[PDB]
PDB file of C-alpha atoms and ligand atoms in Angstrom:
ATOM      1  CA  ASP A   1      -1.851  13.711 -11.832  1.00 22.99           C
ATOM      2  CA  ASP A   2      -5.406  13.165 -10.292  1.00 21.78           C
ATOM      3  CA  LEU A   3      -4.854   9.232 -10.159  1.00 18.04           C
ATOM      4  CA  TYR A   4      -1.548   9.562  -8.582  1.00 18.10           C
ATOM      5  CA  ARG A   5      -2.808  12.389  -5.864  1.00 18.01           C
ATOM      6  CA  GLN A   6      -5.989   9.822  -5.146  1.00 17.22           C
ATOM      7  CA  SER A   7      -3.737   7.145  -5.236  1.00 16.56           C
ATOM      8  CA  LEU A   8      -1.203   8.687  -2.701  1.00 14.27           C
ATOM      9  CA  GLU A   9      -4.213   9.792  -0.339  1.00 12.49           C
ATOM     10  CA  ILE A  10      -5.899   6.185   0.136  1.00 13.76           C
ATOM     11  CA  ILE A  11      -2.201   4.530   0.435  1.00 14.07           C
ATOM     12  CA  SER A  12      -0.906   7.227   2.863  1.00 11.91           C
ATOM     13  CA  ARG A  13      -4.262   7.620   4.395  1.00  8.71           C
ATOM     14  CA  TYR A  14      -4.332   3.213   4.948  1.00  9.39           C
ATOM     15  CA  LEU A  15      -0.226   2.735   6.316  1.00 11.83           C
ATOM     16  CA  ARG A  16      -1.126   5.786   8.827  1.00 12.11           C
ATOM     17  CA  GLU A  17      -3.876   4.755  10.440  1.00 13.07           C
ATOM     18  CA  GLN A  18      -2.291   1.199  10.125  1.00 14.04           C
ATOM     19  CA  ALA A  19       0.779   2.223  12.112  1.00 15.41           C
ATOM     20  CA  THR A  20      -1.117   4.398  14.836  1.00 11.34           C
ATOM     21  CA  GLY A  21      -3.285   1.468  15.738  1.00 13.05           C
ATOM     22  CA  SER A  22      -6.541   3.835  14.141  1.00 13.51           C
ATOM     23  CA  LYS A  23      -9.749   1.764  12.906  1.00 16.26           C
ATOM     24  CA  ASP A  24     -10.391   6.097  10.365  1.00 18.48           C
ATOM     25  CA  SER A  25      -8.689   8.940   8.782  1.00 18.41           C
ATOM     26  CA  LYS A  26     -10.082  12.992   7.878  1.00 19.59           C
ATOM     27  CA  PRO A  27     -10.120  13.266   4.065  1.00 22.21           C
ATOM     28  CA  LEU A  28      -7.522  14.892   2.731  1.00 20.26           C
ATOM     29  CA  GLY A  29      -8.650  16.628   0.140  1.00 20.78           C
ATOM     30  CA  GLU A  30      -7.290  14.456  -3.432  1.00 21.06           C
ATOM     31  CA  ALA A  31      -9.021  11.147  -2.921  1.00 19.24           C
ATOM     32  CA  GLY A  32     -12.419  12.199  -4.368  1.00 20.89           C
ATOM     33  CA  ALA A  33     -15.943  10.198  -3.992  1.00 16.83           C
ATOM     34  CA  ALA A  34     -14.618   7.130  -4.332  1.00 14.51           C
ATOM     35  CA  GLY A  35     -11.781   7.600  -1.573  1.00 12.33           C
ATOM     36  CA  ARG A  36     -13.859   6.663   1.275  1.00 12.74           C
ATOM     37  CA  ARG A  37     -15.387   3.010  -0.458  1.00 15.78           C
ATOM     38  CA  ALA A  38     -11.538   2.389  -2.022  1.00 16.84           C
ATOM     39  CA  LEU A  39     -10.543   3.118   2.045  1.00 16.29           C
ATOM     40  CA  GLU A  40     -13.084   1.444   3.759  1.00 13.38           C
ATOM     41  CA  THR A  41     -12.810  -1.381   1.096  1.00 13.22           C
ATOM     42  CA  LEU A  42      -8.485  -1.558   1.757  1.00 10.02           C
ATOM     43  CA  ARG A  43      -9.310  -2.032   5.514  1.00 10.15           C
ATOM     44  CA  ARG A  44     -11.026  -4.835   5.059  1.00  9.49           C
ATOM     45  CA  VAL A  45      -8.943  -7.001   2.433  1.00  5.59           C
ATOM     46  CA  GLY A  46      -5.543  -5.015   3.510  1.00  4.28           C
ATOM     47  CA  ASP A  47      -6.198  -5.704   7.027  1.00  5.01           C
ATOM     48  CA  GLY A  48      -7.138 -10.019   6.393  1.00  4.43           C
ATOM     49  CA  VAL A  49      -4.221  -9.914   3.800  1.00  7.89           C
ATOM     50  CA  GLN A  50      -1.802  -8.640   6.667  1.00  6.56           C
ATOM     51  CA  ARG A  51      -3.261 -11.358   8.932  1.00  9.20           C
ATOM     52  CA  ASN A  52      -3.658 -14.547   6.505  1.00 10.80           C
ATOM     53  CA  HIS A  53      -0.346 -13.691   5.300  1.00  9.83           C
ATOM     54  CA  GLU A  54       1.297 -12.863   8.791  1.00  8.48           C
ATOM     55  CA  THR A  55       4.558 -15.443   8.813  1.00 10.79           C
ATOM     56  CA  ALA A  56       5.654 -14.131   5.258  1.00 12.47           C
ATOM     57  CA  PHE A  57       5.500 -11.221   5.854  1.00 11.68           C
ATOM     58  CA  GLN A  58       7.036 -10.934   9.542  1.00 13.22           C
ATOM     59  CA  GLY A  59      10.019 -13.186   7.630  1.00 14.32           C
ATOM     60  CA  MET A  60      10.422 -10.790   4.303  1.00 15.01           C
ATOM     61  CA  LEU A  61       9.865  -8.002   7.094  1.00 15.71           C
ATOM     62  CA  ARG A  62      13.011  -9.184   8.829  1.00 16.51           C
ATOM     63  CA  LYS A  63      14.940 -10.683   5.588  1.00 15.37           C
ATOM     64  CA  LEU A  64      14.586  -6.481   4.477  1.00 17.20           C
ATOM     65  CA  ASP A  65      16.191  -5.214   8.079  1.00 16.86           C
ATOM     66  CA  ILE A  66      14.388  -1.941   7.707  1.00 16.86           C
ATOM     67  CA  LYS A  67      16.030   0.217  10.496  1.00 15.42           C
ATOM     68  CA  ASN A  68      16.154   3.919   8.942  1.00 15.70           C
ATOM     69  CA  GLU A  69      15.117   6.613   5.878  1.00 13.04           C
ATOM     70  CA  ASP A  70      18.217   5.024   4.093  1.00 10.99           C
ATOM     71  CA  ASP A  71      16.713   1.428   4.635  1.00 10.86           C
ATOM     72  CA  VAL A  72      13.535   2.637   3.567  1.00  9.41           C
ATOM     73  CA  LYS A  73      14.613   4.194   0.567  1.00 10.50           C
ATOM     74  CA  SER A  74      16.601   0.831  -0.624  1.00  9.63           C
ATOM     75  CA  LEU A  75      13.006  -1.267  -0.880  1.00  9.74           C
ATOM     76  CA  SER A  76      11.913   0.920  -4.021  1.00  8.07           C
ATOM     77  CA  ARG A  77      14.550  -2.191  -6.278  1.00  8.15           C
ATOM     78  CA  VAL A  78      13.376  -4.490  -4.942  1.00  8.72           C
ATOM     79  CA  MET A  79       9.493  -3.271  -4.268  1.00  7.62           C
ATOM     80  CA  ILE A  80       9.871  -3.077  -8.201  1.00  5.61           C
ATOM     81  CA  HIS A  81      11.476  -5.506  -9.336  1.00  2.63           C
ATOM     82  CA  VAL A  82       8.704  -8.085  -7.167  1.00  2.91           C
ATOM     83  CA  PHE A  83       5.820  -6.222  -8.164  1.00  4.81           C
ATOM     84  CA  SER A  84       6.305  -6.358 -12.198  1.00  2.76           C
ATOM     85  CA  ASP A  85       7.290  -9.328 -12.183  1.00  2.80           C
ATOM     86  CA  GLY A  86       4.048 -11.248 -13.786  1.00  2.00           C
ATOM     87  CA  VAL A  87       1.022 -10.845 -14.133  1.00  3.52           C
ATOM     88  CA  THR A  88      -1.685  -7.808 -13.333  1.00  4.11           C
ATOM     89  CA  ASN A  89      -4.659  -7.878 -10.713  1.00  4.28           C
ATOM     90  CA  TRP A  90      -6.041  -6.365  -7.793  1.00  3.11           C
ATOM     91  CA  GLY A  91      -4.676  -9.129  -5.532  1.00  2.00           C
ATOM     92  CA  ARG A  92      -1.235  -8.168  -6.123  1.00  3.36           C
ATOM     93  CA  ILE A  93      -2.231  -4.387  -5.626  1.00  3.61           C
ATOM     94  CA  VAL A  94      -3.529  -5.124  -2.554  1.00  5.08           C
ATOM     95  CA  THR A  95      -0.556  -7.072  -0.772  1.00 10.55           C
ATOM     96  CA  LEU A  96       1.490  -4.298  -2.165  1.00 12.53           C
ATOM     97  CA  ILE A  97      -0.110  -1.659   0.052  1.00 13.94           C
ATOM     98  CA  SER A  98      -0.191  -4.492   2.409  1.00 17.27           C
ATOM     99  CA  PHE A  99       3.143  -4.945   2.924  1.00 14.33           C
ATOM    100  CA  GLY A 100       3.000  -1.468   3.243  1.00 15.26           C
ATOM    101  CA  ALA A 101       0.827  -1.148   6.574  1.00 14.62           C
ATOM    102  CA  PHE A 102       2.497  -4.113   7.482  1.00 12.95           C
ATOM    103  CA  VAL A 103       5.961  -1.997   7.229  1.00 11.23           C
ATOM    104  CA  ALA A 104       4.672   1.405   8.531  1.00  9.76           C
ATOM    105  CA  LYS A 105       3.661  -0.171  11.938  1.00 10.16           C
ATOM    106  CA  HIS A 106       7.101  -1.416  11.918  1.00 11.76           C
ATOM    107  CA  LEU A 107       8.746   1.859  10.912  1.00 11.48           C
ATOM    108  CA  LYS A 108       6.555   3.120  14.555  1.00 12.30           C
ATOM    109  CA  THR A 109       7.944   0.307  16.611  1.00 11.62           C
ATOM    110  CA  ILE A 110      11.368   1.114  15.922  1.00 12.63           C
ATOM    111  CA  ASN A 111      10.332   5.665  16.153  1.00 15.60           C
ATOM    112  CA  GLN A 112      10.569   6.216  12.535  1.00 15.02           C
ATOM    113  CA  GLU A 113       7.562   7.470  11.687  1.00 12.90           C
ATOM    114  CA  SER A 114       8.853  10.180  10.307  1.00 13.29           C
ATOM    115  CA  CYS A 115       9.941   7.446   6.991  1.00 11.72           C
ATOM    116  CA  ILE A 116       6.083   6.573   6.537  1.00 10.62           C
ATOM    117  CA  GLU A 117       4.930   9.537   4.309  1.00 12.38           C
ATOM    118  CA  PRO A 118       7.793   8.677   2.263  1.00 15.05           C
ATOM    119  CA  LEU A 119       7.167   5.030   2.149  1.00 20.38           C
ATOM    120  CA  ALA A 120       3.571   5.807   1.151  1.00 21.09           C
ATOM    121  CA  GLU A 121       5.616   7.682  -1.725  1.00 20.98           C
ATOM    122  CA  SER A 122       7.797   4.661  -2.950  1.00 21.13           C
ATOM    123  CA  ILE A 123       4.580   2.331  -2.587  1.00 20.99           C
ATOM    124  CA  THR A 124       2.356   5.593  -4.710  1.00 25.03           C
ATOM    125  CA  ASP A 125       5.122   6.109  -7.438  1.00 24.24           C
ATOM    126  CA  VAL A 126       5.524   1.955  -7.920  1.00 25.35           C
ATOM    127  CA  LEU A 127       2.236   1.442  -8.273  1.00 27.40           C
ATOM    128  CA  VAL A 128       0.695   3.878 -10.469  1.00 30.72           C
ATOM    129  CA  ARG A 129       3.745   5.050 -12.723  1.00 29.12           C
ATOM    130  CA  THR A 130       3.794   0.693 -13.599  1.00 28.11           C
ATOM    131  CA  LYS A 131       0.121   0.530 -13.798  1.00 26.72           C
ATOM    132  CA  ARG A 132      -1.217   3.179 -14.787  1.00 26.87           C
ATOM    133  CA  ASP A 133      -2.898   1.501 -18.215  1.00 28.19           C
ATOM    134  CA  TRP A 134      -4.331  -0.900 -16.220  1.00 25.20           C
ATOM    135  CA  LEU A 135      -5.774   1.144 -13.790  1.00 24.20           C
ATOM    136  CA  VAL A 136      -7.826   3.551 -15.829  1.00 21.21           C
ATOM    137  CA  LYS A 137      -8.939   0.099 -17.746  1.00 25.27           C
ATOM    138  CA  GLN A 138     -10.586  -1.052 -14.351  1.00 25.74           C
ATOM    139  CA  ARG A 139     -10.874   2.489 -13.526  1.00 23.74           C
ATOM    140  CA  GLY A 140      -9.315   3.267 -11.023  1.00 22.06           C
ATOM    141  CA  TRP A 141     -10.365   2.977  -7.094  1.00 20.97           C
ATOM    142  CA  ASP A 142     -13.991   2.616  -8.627  1.00 18.91           C
ATOM    143  CA  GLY A 143     -12.666  -0.537 -10.259  1.00 19.00           C
ATOM    144  CA  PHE A 144     -10.801  -1.881  -6.596  1.00 21.38           C
ATOM    145  CA  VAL A 145     -14.201  -1.160  -4.434  1.00 23.69           C
ATOM    146  CA  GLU A 146     -16.184  -3.278  -6.871  1.00 22.69           C
ATOM    147  CA  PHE A 147     -14.061  -6.026  -7.387  1.00 19.82           C
ATOM    148  CA  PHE A 148     -14.218  -6.641  -3.616  1.00 17.69           C
ATOM    149  CA  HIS A 149     -17.610  -5.800  -3.232  1.00 16.04           C
ATOM    150  CA  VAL A 150     -17.235  -5.567   0.726  1.00 16.19           C
TER     151      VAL A 150
HETATM  152  C1  E4Q B   1      10.285  -8.245  -0.801  1.00 16.76           C
HETATM  153  C2  E4Q B   1      10.124  -9.656  -2.142  1.00 16.76           C
HETATM  154  C3  E4Q B   1       8.468 -10.233  -1.902  1.00 16.76           C
HETATM  155  C4  E4Q B   1       8.924 -11.454  -2.548  1.00 16.76           C
HETATM  156  C5  E4Q B   1       8.007 -12.623  -2.375  1.00 16.76           C
HETATM  157  S1  E4Q B   1       7.974 -14.249  -1.511  1.00 16.76           S
HETATM  158  C6  E4Q B   1       7.327 -13.461  -0.010  1.00 16.76           C
HETATM  159  C7  E4Q B   1       5.873 -13.644   0.263  1.00 16.76           C
HETATM  160  N1  E4Q B   1       5.775 -14.505  -0.062  1.00 16.76           N
HETATM  161  N2  E4Q B   1       3.941 -14.315   0.028  1.00 16.76           N
HETATM  162  C8  E4Q B   1       3.060 -15.460   0.376  1.00 16.76           C
HETATM  163  C9  E4Q B   1       3.519 -12.668  -0.100  1.00 16.76           C
HETATM  164  C10 E4Q B   1       2.561 -12.763   0.190  1.00 16.76           C
HETATM  165  C11 E4Q B   1       5.338 -12.352  -0.093  1.00 16.76           C
HETATM  166  C12 E4Q B   1       5.423 -11.091   0.175  1.00 16.76           C
HETATM  167  C13 E4Q B   1       6.028 -10.144   0.765  1.00 16.76           C
HETATM  168  C14 E4Q B   1       6.411  -8.964   0.649  1.00 16.76           C
HETATM  169  C15 E4Q B   1       5.629  -8.106  -0.241  1.00 16.76           C
HETATM  170  C16 E4Q B   1       4.958  -8.659  -1.481  1.00 16.76           C
HETATM  171  C17 E4Q B   1       4.731  -8.538  -2.788  1.00 16.76           C
HETATM  172  C18 E4Q B   1       4.168  -7.271  -3.361  1.00 16.76           C
HETATM  173  C19 E4Q B   1       5.740  -6.537  -4.013  1.00 16.76           C
HETATM  174  C20 E4Q B   1       6.710  -6.809  -3.359  1.00 16.76           C
HETATM  175  O1  E4Q B   1       6.792  -5.137  -2.664  1.00 16.76           O
HETATM  176  C21 E4Q B   1       7.630  -4.878  -1.447  1.00 16.76           C
HETATM  177  C22 E4Q B   1       8.914  -5.566  -1.458  1.00 16.76           C
HETATM  178  C23 E4Q B   1       9.594  -4.849  -0.887  1.00 16.76           C
HETATM  179  C24 E4Q B   1       9.912  -3.586   0.273  1.00 16.76           C
HETATM  180  C25 E4Q B   1       8.183  -3.277   0.209  1.00 16.76           C
HETATM  181  C26 E4Q B   1       7.517  -2.500   1.469  1.00 16.76           C
HETATM  182  C27 E4Q B   1       6.361  -1.621   1.384  1.00 16.76           C
HETATM  183  C28 E4Q B   1       5.159  -2.407   0.743  1.00 16.76           C
HETATM  184  C29 E4Q B   1       5.697  -3.136  -0.868  1.00 16.76           C
HETATM  185  C30 E4Q B   1       7.054  -3.617  -0.926  1.00 16.76           C
HETATM  186  C31 E4Q B   1       3.781  -9.879  -3.522  1.00 16.76           C
HETATM  187  C32 E4Q B   1       3.106  -9.911  -4.748  1.00 16.76           C
HETATM  188  O2  E4Q B   1       3.499  -8.794  -5.151  1.00 16.76           O
HETATM  189  O3  E4Q B   1       2.634 -11.201  -4.993  1.00 16.76           O
HETATM  190  N3  E4Q B   1       4.094 -10.795  -2.452  1.00 16.76           N
HETATM  191  C33 E4Q B   1       4.529 -10.018  -1.461  1.00 16.76           C
HETATM  192  N4  E4Q B   1       9.728 -11.772  -2.688  1.00 16.76           N
HETATM  193  N5  E4Q B   1      11.196 -10.314  -2.301  1.00 16.76           N
HETATM  194  C34 E4Q B   1      12.495 -10.559  -2.453  1.00 16.76           C
END
């Protein structure tokens, strides 16, 4: 429960600042101690993932053809299917969130800023609900910060 809210805040803040072209955001009270360092790490690693995988991200975004809220809702099916296929690791978790930021930037360009918070919830549901046991074993977001040790 606490992990869900903490994850939702980190993911929501990162998607929102990526879409508005911001490098920071105010804490919303649910991310706690680990929140600041997690978002700082996610900005570093996440920005890098979007840069290094830009052609693949542009290709997939185009194929997904996201124009509105109904299209955003439809993403959860493929999101859970792809994210559940294969190994669990921090690298894949960053790819999931980074693609979310890449989609959020797209949503802002097409005046669909209202879809960003629903998308963050979609991503948080997939991440936390399918990886809760693994996240607990890694000490969640403290594990994330330590793994990348930026
Ligand atoms: C959507 C999809 C993805 C694939 C993998 S091939 C594309 C591809 N090539 N490379 C080299 C990379 C890095 C990707 C790629 C592109 C986009 C996302 C991912 C993911 C995360 C899981 C799927 O996440 C989402 C699916 C849909 C909408 C989403 C909207 C917001 C946030 C996440 C979303 C991975 C991975 O787990 O390794 N890899 C990704 N197949 N499909 C159908």
